[PDB]
C-alpha cells in the first residue's frame, strides 16, 4: 500500500506545475510563497519527503490542480 500511495504523489510532483519563488518558512507544515500568477499563496509542503531542505530561499513549483507545494 505504501508503494501504491507513493505512485499517486509522484504524478502530482510532476506537471502540471506553476512556478513561484519561495521566500521563507513560517511552519514546517505550511510555508509562504509568491507566484508569477499574481497571487501570494500559503501552500502546504508535501509530507514523507523533505520539508527541511525546503526552507532556504530558492525557486519553487506549486501544483496547478491541488494548489500545494509538492
Amino acid at each position: 500500500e505504501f508503494l501504491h500511495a507513493q505512485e499517486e504523489v509522484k504524478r502530482i510532483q510532476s506537471i502540471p506545475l506553476v512556478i513561484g519563488q519561495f521566500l521563507e518558512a513560517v511552519d514546517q507544515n505550511t510555508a509562504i510563497v509568491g507566484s508569477t500568477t499574481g497571487s501570494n499563496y500559503y501552500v502546504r509542503i508535501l509530507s514523507t519527503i523533505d520539508r527541511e531542505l525546503l526552507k532556504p530561499n530558492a525557486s519553487v513549483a506549486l501544483h496547478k490542480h491541488s494548489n500545494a507545494l509538492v
Partner: protein, 51 residues
C-alpha cells in the same frame, strides 16, 4: 524531439496538464519582414562616384 524546445521558439502546451502537444513554429513579426523586402532608395546600388 527535445530540440523542439530551445530558448525563444514557440511551443503549444496543453492547458490542463502542461505537457507538450506540439511544436509551434515561431511567429514572424511583419515589421521585420517589411525591413528585409524594402529598399528605401531610388538610387544605384553599384556606385555613386566620389563617394
Amino acid at each position: 524531439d527535445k530540440s523542439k524546445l530551445k530558448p525563444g521558439t514557440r511551443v503549444a502546451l496543453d492547458m490542463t496538464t502542461l505537457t507538450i502537444m506540439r511544436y509551434l513554429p515561431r511567429e514572424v513579426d511583419p515589421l521585420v519582414y517589411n525591413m528585409s523586402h524594402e529598399d528605401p532608395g531610388n538610387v544605384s546600388y553599384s556606385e555613386i562616384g566620389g563617394l
